[PDB]
Amino acid sequence: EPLAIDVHRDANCGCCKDWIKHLEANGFKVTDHVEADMSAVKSRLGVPYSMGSCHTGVIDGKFVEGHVPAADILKLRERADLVGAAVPGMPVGSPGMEMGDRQDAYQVVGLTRSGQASVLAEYP
Numbered sequence: 001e002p003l004a005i006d007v008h009r010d011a012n013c014g015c016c017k018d019w020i021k022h023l024e025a026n027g028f029k030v031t032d033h034v035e036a037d038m039s040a041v042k043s044r045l046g047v048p049y050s051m052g053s054c055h056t057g058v059i060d061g062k063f064v065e066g067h068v069p070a071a072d073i074l075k076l077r078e079r080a081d082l083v084g085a086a087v088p089g090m091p092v093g094s095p096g097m098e099m100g101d102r103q104d105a106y107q108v109v110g111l112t113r114s115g116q117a118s119v120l121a122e123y124p
């Protein structure tokens, strides 16, 4: 099939739409909607409490929380031990949150079912 991701996103959030455009430019087929019950979406997918962000994607059963770069979504897909990856919050400089030369340091955090956190990528 075409590579595809479904995105549940915060209402009135411009960065989520920009992140979707970066994914599309990376070849992802994206479907999305503004979310009515984001607590339900995140808790059903197993996104940890303080790892939430402004949108939640779902690809091949695994969650993509926040402004995860496309290349790290591909790494998520090929790690059988991981059920999701998160960039908590909204760090400036992450894809869809970019605003000039500046960047909040951030990590893409992979998560196992056992609750283990495994860093997929670090950005200065």
Ligand SMILES: [Cu+2]
Residues within 6 Å of the ligand: 013, 014, 015, 016, 054, 055, 067, 090, 097
């Ligand atoms: Cu955002």
Ligand SMILES: [Cu+2]
Residues within 6 Å of the ligand: 015, 016, 054, 090, 097
């Ligand atoms: Cu944002």
Ligand SMILES: [Cu+2]
Residues within 6 Å of the ligand: 010, 013, 014, 015, 016, 017, 054, 055
């Ligand atoms: Cu947004």
Ligand SMILES: [Cu+2]
Residues within 6 Å of the ligand: 009, 010, 013, 015, 016, 017, 019, 053, 054, 055, 066
């Ligand atoms: Cu978002």
Ligand SMILES: [Zn+2]
Residues within 6 Å of the ligand: 007, 008, 009, 033, 034, 035, 036, 041
């Ligand atoms: Zn939804």
Ligand SMILES: [Zn+2]
Residues within 6 Å of the ligand: 020, 021, 024
């Ligand atoms: Zn689009």
Ligand SMILES: [Zn+2]
Residues within 6 Å of the ligand: 030, 031, 032
């Ligand atoms: Zn679209």
Ligand SMILES: [Zn+2]
Residues within 6 Å of the ligand: 031, 032, 033
């Ligand atoms: Zn859309």
Ligand SMILES: [Zn+2]
Residues within 6 Å of the ligand: 075, 078
């Ligand atoms: Zn690979």
Ligand SMILES: [Zn+2]
Residues within 6 Å of the ligand: 018, 019, 022, 095, 096, 097, 098
């Ligand atoms: Zn952008």
